[PDB]
Amino acid sequence: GVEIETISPGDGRTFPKKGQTCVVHYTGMLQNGKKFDSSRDRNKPFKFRIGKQEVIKGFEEGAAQMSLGQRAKLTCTPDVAYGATGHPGVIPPNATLIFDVELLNLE
Amino acid sequence: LSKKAKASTVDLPIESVSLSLQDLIGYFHPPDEHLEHEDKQNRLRALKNRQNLFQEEGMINLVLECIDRLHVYSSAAHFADVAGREAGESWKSILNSLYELLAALIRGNRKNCAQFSGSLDWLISRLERLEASSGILEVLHCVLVESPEALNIIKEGHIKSIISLLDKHGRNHKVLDVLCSLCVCHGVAVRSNQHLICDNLLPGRDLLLQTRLVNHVSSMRPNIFLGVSEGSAQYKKWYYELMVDHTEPFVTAEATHLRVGWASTEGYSPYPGGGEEWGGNGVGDDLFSYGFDGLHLWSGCIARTVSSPNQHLLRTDDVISCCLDLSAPSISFRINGQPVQGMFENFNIDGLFFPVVSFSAGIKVRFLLGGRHGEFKFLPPPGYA
Amino acid sequence: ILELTEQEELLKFHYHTLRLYSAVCALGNHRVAHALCSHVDEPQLLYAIENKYMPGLLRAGYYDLLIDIHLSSYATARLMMNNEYIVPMTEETKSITLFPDENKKHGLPGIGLSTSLRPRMQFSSPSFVSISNECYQYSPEFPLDILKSKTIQMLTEAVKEGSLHARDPVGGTTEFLFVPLIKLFYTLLIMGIFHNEDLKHILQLIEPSVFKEAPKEGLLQMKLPEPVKLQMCLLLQYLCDCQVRHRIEAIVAFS
Amino acid sequence: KKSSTLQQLISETMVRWAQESVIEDPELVRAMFVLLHRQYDGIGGLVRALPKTYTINGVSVEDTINLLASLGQIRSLLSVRMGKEEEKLMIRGLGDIMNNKVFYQHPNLMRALGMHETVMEVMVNVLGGGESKEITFPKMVANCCRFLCYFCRISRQNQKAMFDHLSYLLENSSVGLASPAMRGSTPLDVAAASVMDNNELALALREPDLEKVVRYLAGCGLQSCQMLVSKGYPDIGWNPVEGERYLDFLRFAVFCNGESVEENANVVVRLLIRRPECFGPALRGEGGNGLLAAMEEAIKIAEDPSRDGPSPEEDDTIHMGNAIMTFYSALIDLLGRCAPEMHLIHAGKGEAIRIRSILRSLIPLGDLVGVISIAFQMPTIAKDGNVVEPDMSAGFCPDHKAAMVLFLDRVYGIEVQDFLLHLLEVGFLPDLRAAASLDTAALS
Amino acid sequence: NLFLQGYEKSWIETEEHYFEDKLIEDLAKPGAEPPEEDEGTKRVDPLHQLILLFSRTALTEKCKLEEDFLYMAYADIMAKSCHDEEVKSFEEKEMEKQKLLYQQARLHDRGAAEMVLQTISASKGETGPMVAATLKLGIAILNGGNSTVQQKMLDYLKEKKDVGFFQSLAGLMQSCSVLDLNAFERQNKAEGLGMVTEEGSGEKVLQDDEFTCDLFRFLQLLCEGHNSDFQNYLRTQTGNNTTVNIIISTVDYLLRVQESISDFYWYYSGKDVIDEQGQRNFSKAIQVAKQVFNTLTEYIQGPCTGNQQSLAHSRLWDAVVGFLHVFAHMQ
């Protein structure tokens, strides 16, 4: 349920492995074009370990499919992103989220 | 009248009721601000005593009964049909005056606003109707600011009705003020109402005005103005190239903007058409320009993903070649010598066309317009001047 | 947004929208503050902070929204226990003295080694991709150093601008120029972000001659409006409270 | 030269502004003159600051930090209205505070931080919310009352600080007395803990407060329990469950450290005889069957399911018979404790003589002898051998007779050997024989 | 910790500095008024603004008079400024009287009398530190029988038609305390037990002797100097819709304090020696009774025939026949 449109190419050899923290700069957006989150806005890279169930799953598969240094557009369907309940106060119910994700570094 | 008795036989003190309501509004008029302190305090004391006596005699319920009996009739025309012409014209004014009197009776007095607690639920039930929206909203504001028990009474459905008032009646800052009063009362905040107001108003992003921090975008164009017309000596095919010497993907928090392509002018005036001079708009953000960002064909501020071998956002050392056939309206692109699989076709040819590029910051590009000015990295398509 | 200076209806509606944003996050609703960080983010806040052409009402609303969303809960926390003095009796506490040196001259208020127990700084980063709920504890993080530098730079410029009695203060009136900026400065001082040389510079701004370390007049003699005078009184009261706390610490050290 | 001091600078600028312009904003004038007064009364600054100054060693710093954070959370709950999640927040905060060792080691710091009045204010706000409508969030109220009682028991100075707020507590005495499993967690319990086992505090206790309590007891004796009849309990005229609580408070008020506070006992007896409705229907004096008849009828009621239970261990099923028995037992215990001391009665003080005479008139000897003569049901092993123990709180309790004995020995005086042997044979010997029979292993 | 508390209560409290005169003198100075841009009437001086704020706070309608730290601070400051407290000759006597007149002028020229009447009226007859400080300030500005201040207060009361002032005076009179022999016996048994109460002073007997003496010194100074018009006003408030007989209320309090003194005597009838606490209670109660008697004497002097008849028909004679017995036996 996650698609990858490559804005910028990556090395193509290095990918997120199990138990490895992936740092990314993401710019979350709704389909209508509005923005709800941006690690670039806070000027702090977002730091998460893949496969440890800490981020929305669709973002997780998108990052896993990404490669080092690659910049890609992650379209996350409502099932893989916040579901029918939606994130209260930010994400409306049954919302599809598109992210501009860049894999800054892999560790 | 409700028992369908004859209107002439029934007596309705229409004029005297309005005159007395004006008298009561004057009698409960709040003291004027510029008055001296002592006189102001005396008049507040008198108003407080008046409200106390009226509430003890139970005038609030009488006013509520009159308001209910007037709301029995849906519209001014309906009241004019069930009653006399004079009642028809006075229905709106009397109903507004009653709400003004209710607000005057409850305003500033804590005990009256506390006794209004039972009637909060009934009052909000008529918030949607236009003839009483302003008066009901004012009464609600007074009760909320004065009585904490009103905040206890207000429920999720009442908050949703107040919010839907914004959706149906448009933007009104008084509804926002009422919602603010709901959140905090006398230095005490209610977590339930805060959460409900947030979770119901904010996520939609359709009622409150939205904000974003957007980069400025500027457009550079050559002096040429090429167009197509019958019996006019212009070569319908044209070709030019642009190379990105340097580009920064993120100079600011927002992504950099770099689009290349053709643009047209409404009429024969040299001003580019359909776009504002300054702002965040660039090539393709109107139906007068046509752009290529490296991944999307931009026209009318709508982007479509166009395929291309090793498609990427326009980066350093990228040579973009633009094509224009005015014989059959068609704009084609070709990045690094290989063609992208997208075309702008059957667009308007009334006006003149010219090359244009849009950039925001950190952009370093060079026009290659052919001949002495620029030397084409790639060979122009056959017959393209 | 700067085009609203001439459209009164949208200006008023957006000012009330900003005040509603403040109200929903008022009194430490950390969850609602995290939610609001999406609608109004850090770059938007800072640009509203610094822009000189902003309408007065929007400027006043934005300086309050920033305070309420990011730095209000800790400000109230440290302000609530400002009258209690639990002083650990350790060596750095024993080192405290009433006067900085042998000469009996008062040191600059605030600057010094204070050992009294004090609430703990803690902020949670708002990330909506995260599914964790522990971030709803504490309030959203903000660049407290960039904010500090910007606040002092803006106040330094504002002192020079006001002395000139310029036709156009930022926001249209001297009140809109000063009172919200002074409010943000006071909030930062209450949080105690300012320290050492930075606090020395801001004290020199407040009054050069008196706080000159051991010309251009300060705010206390620059013919301020009454709304600004109240915030000046608040700042001076905080300075007096800092001196009282220093006295209490020195008494505990002597004991 | 320049002022060179913050004090002089403030004193100059405040006066300069005030004489420069007519300040119209009242808050500005107030702030300016408050600041000027602080400058001119700097020693007063230390006068206010020092009481709220405490010192701790290095080892307790972390625990003090955690307790200060918990107190900050509890104080922050004041600014918001009470709610379901606020209940969780308060309860976890108070649990943390009670677990902190500094809470025990430094009671003076705990008092100086004034958390005691903070919890009290939270109580006031929540009690005011839904005043007549029982108590919303009853568990949170129970937790606050438990914390306050424990704070009273920590130290005597804390107990004095608690007793300082007795008037409000008695104003809100009737909050959750009727509901069981709320017992030990009501404001009346906090009042009892504040005036518990402290002779100085018992002497300081005033007469109007006792009058308020006695009026509450009269209301309980006259009017039924509406919350219980709402649950479907049979409607009798008086309120035994709440009356027992109100009598227990008076017991703690009049009996301190083994002796009996004479000043409080005399006032309590006088009020209780000015309004005889508090004694209950058995001893109102008109149509009164008597204490022994009341006990027998209560045994019958407790054995019957229809009266003892509502039928549309106590919070689920308040036993009407046990409630009546414990009410009368508490009343008798209160009277016996209010009886004057034997040293004074032998010294011949007329007031002590008179109070003894009044109590003797109030309660006849034969009724007490009969109540003592009432026997106890013996739990029995079944044919399986498993012991069939009826709920002890359902029926006639040994403490019920313990109160009887206390009254008997403190008002009459066991001085006749014939009466001694009579009481022995009728009530004392059979119970001790029953204990002898129960001395078997399982029955032990 | 023990050292901190002892140091506080032994040194910091006992430290005394006399700044009130300097503060009031500075606050009364109009500073560079012509250089200041008035272009008309002079700006009210800072003391005038402070008094105006304190007056408006009282004039604002509230259900209760909220205790204000600013008011208890500045009221004591102004009272000390007014007072500024071997045999002095006539020159010294006259200089002191002239000094006190000017010191009282610095306040009553700026509405201090109106402020002290308004605070008492807004008290609604509730005893508190607010009204204790207000009464002390009133005594300060009326000390010596300041005819100008008496005239200002009487004129203000007449033109405002104020009934709350006299209602609050009455209510304060009923709220005033007397000897409580029951409390004395309870505290004595506590002392016999030996456990010193956390409140070591133990002045529950005669709760507020200073407040009672101040309340009655105020009323005596109000009629001081044979102010016959003000005495008649106190007896019957002519213009006001409802009147309160302050003369009768005063003698009612005198009767209550007489009964308290008589009971305390009768409790010490048997004991051979009066204990120190008994002597202190007698010392305070006798002073209170003396102040009430002097207040009544100032009521009835200046042959105020109305007051004379009102007290002649009052319960005064019972208090008189009681004090006669007390004096007959205590002598």
Numbering used by the authors:
A (entry chain E): 2 to 108
B (entry chain A): 436 to 820
C (entry chain A): 1641 to 1854, 1889 to 1929
D (entry chain A): 2053 to 2364, 2377 to 2508
E (entry chain A): 3618 to 3702, 3710 to 3955
What did the paper state?
Ryanodine receptor type 2 (RyR2), an intracellular Ca2+ release channel located on the sarcoplasmic reticulum (SR) of cardiomyocytes, is essential for cardiac muscle excitation-contraction coupling. Structurally, RyR2 is a 2.3 MDa homotetramer consisting of two functional regions: a massive cytoplasmic region, also known as the cytoplasmic shell, which comprises several regulatory domains (NTDs, NSol, SPRYs, RYs, JSol, and BSol domains) and the stabilizing subunit calstabin-2, and an activation core and pore region, which comprises the Ca2+ binding site and the transmembrane domains. Dysregulation of Ca2+ handling, characterized by aberrant SR Ca2+ leak, is a pivotal pathophysiological mechanism in a spectrum of cardiac disorders, including heart failure (HF), atrial fibrillation, catecholaminergic polymorphic ventricular tachycardia (CPVT), and other arrhythmogenic disorders. Here, we solved the cryogenic electron microscopy structures of ryanodine receptor 2 variants linked either to heart failure or inherited sudden cardiac death.
